[PDB]
Curated annotation (Swiss-Prot):
Pfam families hit by this protein: 3HCDH, 3HCDH_N, ECH_1
Enoyl-CoA hydratase: annotated segments: 1-188
Matching CDD domains: crotonase-like (cd06558)
Biological function: Catalyzes the formation of a hydroxyacyl-CoA by addition of water on enoyl-CoA. Also exhibits 3-hydroxyacyl-CoA epimerase and 3-hydroxyacyl-CoA dehydrogenase activities. Strongly involved in the anaerobic degradation of long and medium-chain fatty acids in the presence of nitrate and weakly involved in the aerobic degradation of long-chain fatty acids.
Gene Ontology cellular component terms for the protein in this record: cytoplasm; fatty acid beta-oxidation multienzyme complex
Region (3-hydroxyacyl-CoA dehydrogenase): 304-708
NCBIfam families: FadJ, PRK11154.1
KW Oxidoreductase (keyword) present: yes
Quaternary structure, from the entry: Heterotetramer of two alpha chains (FadJ) and two beta chains (FadI).
Similarity-based family: In the N-terminal section; belongs to the enoyl-CoA hydratase/isomerase family.
Expression induction: Unlike the aerobic pathway, the anaerobic pathway is not strongly repressed by FadR regulatory protein.
Protein name in UniProt: Fatty acid oxidation complex subunit alpha
Length: 708
């Protein structure tokens, strides 16, 4: 077969290394390819007439996608993972040690070890295509750049700037990469190799200058003061829950302060030990699960046409649906709302979202105006007879929704899908009177629609397999991570979140402050405390599903007696209207979030606060974990893969734990049964271990079969 790295030497005394991996659509840079590069480098120093070498992708979508993460998953111990890093560090050193000039012609994604390969080169030229992105995202997997990225990057673009790329793993477009010095020049794709061979002719590359902000911190005092500043800023964000953050600041520091060989030793040591940490094994479990979600078509049936969609109901919710289907899926969308202000809000919604991109980022306002041509709003019935799918986002009333179904069935074509955004109404009842109920399905979004990547797809008993496959294809085009959940009350996300929210409110009635509860679960790993979470979504919004959950399952979803009615009777609906819990009237830009002291008189407070922060998070998490196991036992979710994905992306479950089921397997089934059996003794039967979990605890069952 044709090798992954093909070399042909031009007659102008430069060589071109073509990187075409026939296995996958992306150059995954497998560790097995080390001998393929080592056989080529010897042929480069075969003749001294050569003047340069060029790495080109020869693939349309990416340059090098990054190191194959299956290599790490098969490492049995940290010493094997340390060897993979050293073997990678050994190859990048020999490419950099060539007497001729090595230059990378980048087009498409250049991430992970792909950027470490470009950093090992002497010059770089990338394409201005929006697909061309540069970054080191090894830390989203609980690792760090293991092929010299922590050492070559600070030496090139700037130490403080390199920390931002390594700590966050963010991608850089060609514009930002040229200014920071990561790429020497950007060039249209038509003359990329032609521009790359020119840079190879030149004897020396530019002796790059350092930015003034980096020269300001130059010196022993400034370098030690930067790491202490960054160490405190990342400790606030990660809450100390990510070991890669602490090892990155270490490896980057010692490499600058010690010998070149030592920094590479510190890097490979940190890479191998991080590969064995449970945090990285959990973060890589999300990477595998997210990849499996994109591959999963939801159904084996071919998807229906998807050339035009319409949405029923305007407002901020409808505008968010219209935004993601036109600005991400590229499908023209039309909005129907009998209230004109709902149309104005939905249209002014997408305008505000793109004007932010016009402000100091993607810009191209001509494309912004060209993007808004796909959205349209009306209060009449014109422009809907040929819509391929309808997303209903109207008031949560059963009679109103099945009335919208009849409108779609007579005013649209015979094949159009009716996708309901319902959260408390079953899909089967919406399609009860539908002439074609096989085309009625649930498509649950979470507000804000742009910030929430997870969506729930709820087919009812009579939903056709073709309808399921078409709705998930639309969700992926809209940049959403979908899970297909059964038609039961609460679905999965909001169901496992209600006792989590109820217990945080319960401790508010028992004397615990708002700051102590939210800071406890933020320390546990959640991005935002439960009290602040109920406020960002809205008080009535996050609590309206409680009655339906109590009527279908029992008293475990029961909230404190009258505190939910007492807060909504005081016009406190959260950050929407700026009343309740945390007060939002502050004027400070970075003003510390302060709670409204009047929320405690409204709530029936009885106590003085005698519960530590780990107990606070334990009481909230154990009630969520119990609901998660009940969903996978009742087949509400299709598998634990969807359950972990649904919680990490839906309710912000801490990613370093890998999801609720990875967390239970981390602690052990029988171990969490004893924990909840103890909480049930001193708090109430709502903490009773669920019926499925005691079976797993009595045996040696785990949620994910291959154990570790």
């Amino acid at each position: 077969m044709t090798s992954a790295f093909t070399l042909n030497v031009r007659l102008d005394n430069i060589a071109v290394i073509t990187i075409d991996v026939p296995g996958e659509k992306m150059n995954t840079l497998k560790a097995e390819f080390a001998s393929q590069v080592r056989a080529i480098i010897k042929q480069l120093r075969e003749n001294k007439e050569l003047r340069g070498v060029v790495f080109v992708s020869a693939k349309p979508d990416n340059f090098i996608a990054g190191a194959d993460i299956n290599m790490i998953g098969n490492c049995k111990t940290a010493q094997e993972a340390e060897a993979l890093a050293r073997q990678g560090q050994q190859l990048m050193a020999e490419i950099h040690a060539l007497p001729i000039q090595v230059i990378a012609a980048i087009h498409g994604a250049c991430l992970g070890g792909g950027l470490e390969l470009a950093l090992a080169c002497h010059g770089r030229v990338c394409t201005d295509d929006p697909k061309t992105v540069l970054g080191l995202p090894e830390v989203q997997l609980g690792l760090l750049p293991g092929s010299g990225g922590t050492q070559r990057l600070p030496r090139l673009i700037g130490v403080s700037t390199a920390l931002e790329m390594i700590l966050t793993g963010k991608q850089l477009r060609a514009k930002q990469a040229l200014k920071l010095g990561l790429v020497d020049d950007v060039v249209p794709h038509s003359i990329l190799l032609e521009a790359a061979v020119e840079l190879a002719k030149k004897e020396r590359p530019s002796s790059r200058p350092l930015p003034v902000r980096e020269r300001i911190l130059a010196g022993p005092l400034g370098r030690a003061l930067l790491f202490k500043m960054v160490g405190k800023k990342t400790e606030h964000k990660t809450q100390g829950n990510y070991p890669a953050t602490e090892r990155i600041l270490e490896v980057v520091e010692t490499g600058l302060a010690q010998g070149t060989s030592s920094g590479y030793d510190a890097e490979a040591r940190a890479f191998g030990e991080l590969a064995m940490t449970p945090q990285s094994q959990a973060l890589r479990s999300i990477f595998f699960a997210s990849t499996d979600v994109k591959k999963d078509p939801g159904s084996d049936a071919p998807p229906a046409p998807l050339n035009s969609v319409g949405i029923l109901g305007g407002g901020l919710m409808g505008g968010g649906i219209a935004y993601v289907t036109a600005c991400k899926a590229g499908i023209p969308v039309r909005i129907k709302d009998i209230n004109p202000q709902g149309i104005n809000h939905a249209l002014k919604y997408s305008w505000d979202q793109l004007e932010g991109k016009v402000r100091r980022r993607h810009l191209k306002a001509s494309e912004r105006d060209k993007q808004l041509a796909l959205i349209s709003g009306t209060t009449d019935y014109r422009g809907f007879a040929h819509r391929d799918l309808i997303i209903e986002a109207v008031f949560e009333n059963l009679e109103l929704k099945q009335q919208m179904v009849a409108e779609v069935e007579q005013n649209c074509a015979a094949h159009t899908i009716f996708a309901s955004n319902t959260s408390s109404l079953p899909i089967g009842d919406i399609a009860a009177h539908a002439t074609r109920p096989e085309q009625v399905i649930g498509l649950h979004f979470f507000s804000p629609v742009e910030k929430m990547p997870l969506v729930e797809i709820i087919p009812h008993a009579g939903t056709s397999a073709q309808t399921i496959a078409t709705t998930v294809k639309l969700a992926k085009k809209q940049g959403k991570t979908p899970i297909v959940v059964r038609d039961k009350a609460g679905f999965y996300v909001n169901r496992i979140l209600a006792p989590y929210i109820n217990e945080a409110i319960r401790m508010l009635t028992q004397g615990e402050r708002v700051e102590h509860i939210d800071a406890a679960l933020v320390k546990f790993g959640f991005p935002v405390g439960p009290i602040q979470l109920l406020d960002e979504v809205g008080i009535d919004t996050g609590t309206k599903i409680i009655p339906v959950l109590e009527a279908a399952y029992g008293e475990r979803f029961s909230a404190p007696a009258n505190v939910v009615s007492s807060i909504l009777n005081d016009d406190r609906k959260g950050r929407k209207n700026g009343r309740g819990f945390y007060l939002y009237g502050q004027k400070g830009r970075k003003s510390k979030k302060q709670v409204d002291p009047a929320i405690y008189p409204l709530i029936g407070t009885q106590g003085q606060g005698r519960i530590s922060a780990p107990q606070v998070a334990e009481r909230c998490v154990m009630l969520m974990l119990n609901e998660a196991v009940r969903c996978v036992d009742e087949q509400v979710i299709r598998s634990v893969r969807d359950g972990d994905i649904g919680a990490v992306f839906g309710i912000g479950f801490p990613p370093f734990l890998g999801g609720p089921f990875r967390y239970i397997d981390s602690l052990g089934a029988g171990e969490v049964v004893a924990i909840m059996q103890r909480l049930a003794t001193q708090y109430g039967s709502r903490f009773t271990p669920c019926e499925r979990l005691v079976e797993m605890g009595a045996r040696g069952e785990s949620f994910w079969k291959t154990t570790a």
